[PDB]
Amino acid sequence: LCTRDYKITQVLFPLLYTVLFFVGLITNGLAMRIFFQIRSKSNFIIFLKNTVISDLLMILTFPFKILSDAKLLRTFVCQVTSVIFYFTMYISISFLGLITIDRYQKTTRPKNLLGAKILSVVIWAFMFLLSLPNMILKSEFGLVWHEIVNYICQVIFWINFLIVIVCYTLITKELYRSYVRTADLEDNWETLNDNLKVIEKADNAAQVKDALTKMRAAALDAQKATPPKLEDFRHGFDILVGQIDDALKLANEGKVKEAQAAAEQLKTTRNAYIQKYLRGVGKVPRKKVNVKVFIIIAVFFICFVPFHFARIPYTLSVFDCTAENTLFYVKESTLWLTSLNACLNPFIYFFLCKSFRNSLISM
Ligand SMILES: CCCCOC(=O)N1CCN(C(=O)[C@H](CP(=O)(O)O)NC(=O)c2cc(N3CC[C@H](OC)C3)nc(-c3ccccc3)n2)CC1
Numbered sequence: 033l034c035t036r037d038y039k040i041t042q043v044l045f046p047l048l049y050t051v052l053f054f055v056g057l058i059t060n061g062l063a064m065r066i067f068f069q070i071r072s073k074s075n076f077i078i079f080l081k082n083t084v085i086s087d088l089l090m091i092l093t094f095p096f097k098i099l100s101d102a103k104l105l106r107t108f109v110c111q112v113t114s115v116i117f118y119f120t121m122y123i124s125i126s127f128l129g130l131i132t133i134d135r136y137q138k139t140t141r142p143k144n145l146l147g148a149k150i151l152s153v154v155i156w157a158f159m160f161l162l163s164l165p166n167m168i169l170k171s172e173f174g175l176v177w178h179e180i181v182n183y184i185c186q187v188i189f190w191i192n193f194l195i196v197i198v199c200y201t202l203i204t205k206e207l208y209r210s211y212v213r214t215a216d217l218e219d220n221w222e223t224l225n226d227n228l229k230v231i232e233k234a235d236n237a238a239q240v241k242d243a244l245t246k247m248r249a250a251a252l253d254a255q256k257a258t259p260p261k262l263e264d265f266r267h268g269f270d271i272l273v274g275q276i277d278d279a280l281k282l283a284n285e286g287k288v289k290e291a292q293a294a295a296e297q298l299k300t301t302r303n304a305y306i307q308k309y310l311r312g313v314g315k316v317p318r319k320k321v322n323v324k325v326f327i328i329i330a331v332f333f334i335c336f337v338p339f340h341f342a343r344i345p346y347t348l349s350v351f352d353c354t355a356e357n358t359l360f361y362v363k364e365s366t367l368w369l370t371s372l373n374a375c376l377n378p379f380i381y382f383f384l385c386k387s388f389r390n391s392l393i394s395m
């Protein structure tokens with residue numbers, strides 16, 4: 033009824049999948065060799081470990097899709113392996129949500145290794161006995177069971193998608209907050225030093241009065257942003273603000289030359305000592321690695337987001353062959369992106385697991 037370019041149907045796609053199959057077998061190959069030469073000492077390494085599996089279960093369905101699509105009984109093994117694939121994909125999606133959570137929790141931190149394995153087994157089993165009826169199969173109980181599983185699967189995606197949205201939203205708000213705090217504090221000090229130069233090269237009392245005002249404000253801002261350390265990180269600020277206040281008085285009284293020299297006293301060795309110490313106390317770096325953590329949301333968005341997003345228009349809202357062909361391609365390519373996950377998961381192991389990257393540095 034409807035015809036498409038076999039250059040794309042029987043060639044491009046089978047090759048695209050062939051790429052994925054190899055690229056995916058090698059990376060997940062040496063991955064599994066690394067992962068069972070690492071003791072499972074946390075939630076994370078454990079969820080990662082399950083990912084290696086569901087990835088190899090994914091790769092091992094590619095050939096049957098490759099040979100079928102390139103036109104090489106022959107049709108029932110297609111229904112089974114595709115079930116195994118769909119099983120595989122929603123497992124990947126489930127663990128990715130857990131990995132998200134697990135990673136999000138370690139970014140709100142300066143009983144497990146046993147419940148983690150159990151939750152894993154729940155994941156698999158609940159997918160398996162949801163994948164069983166589809167490959168168990170006239171009897172029209174099953175083609176309404178398709179609307180059952182298809183429904184479950186939408187919920188599985190959307191819940192884990194929400195998880196991802198929330199966790200990365202909380203991680204983004206925190207990393208932003210952390211950035212602005214440090215950016216401002218650096219600003220504070222930079223203003224202090226900048227308005228001293230202004231003072232140094234100033235004529236009137238108005239120039240001195242203004243720069244000192246900015247300095248006073250910046251200093252007090254710095255002090256606010258720098259609570260004392262639990263171990264003279266409060267008395268120091270009193271000295272610096274003191275000098276600034278003194279210089280301000282001199283500048284208000286009219287004596288600009290004295291003002292400038294009172295200002296200059298921040299350049300004494302002791303005052304600069306104090307400054308360097310107060311600058312020191314201020315910087316306390318402890319933020320989650322940027323392009324390292326976001327890899328997950330990335331992989332999730334590349335692989336799983338499109339297949340589900342693209343469905344909602346033309347699942348919730350035609351005879352012509354271009355529209356039915358547009359749909360074929362959209363579905364088929366999004367499903368390719370889905371499969372790409374088995375190749376993008378090794379990246380998560382690399383960019384986020386210390387021990388993994390070590391074996392990978394070696395073997
Ligand atoms: C726990 C795991 C258990 C194992 O899982 C399974 O066994 N699953 C059964 C198959 N299932 C699907 O998700 C099926 C795949 P298939 O149809 O069987 O190949 N997709 C659809 O049923 C479907 C329908 C649809 N429409 C409904 C009419 C409308 O006509 C206008 C089109 N559109 C799209 C769509 C997709 C991507 C992009 C654009 C559109 N998909 C996944 C879960």
Ligand SMILES: CC(C)CCC[C@@H](C)[C@H]1CC[C@H]2[C@@H]3CC=C4C[C@@H](O)CC[C@]4(C)[C@H]3CC[C@]12C
Pocket residue numbers: 133137191194195198199
């Ligand atoms: C389908 C409708 C009713 C919305 C339901 C969404 C549920 C399933 C999602 C949305 C936001 C999610 C939460 C987002 C963040 C956290 C904090 C983390 O420390 C543990 C998981 C937890 C608590 C998630 C659990 C699942 C959650 C509550």
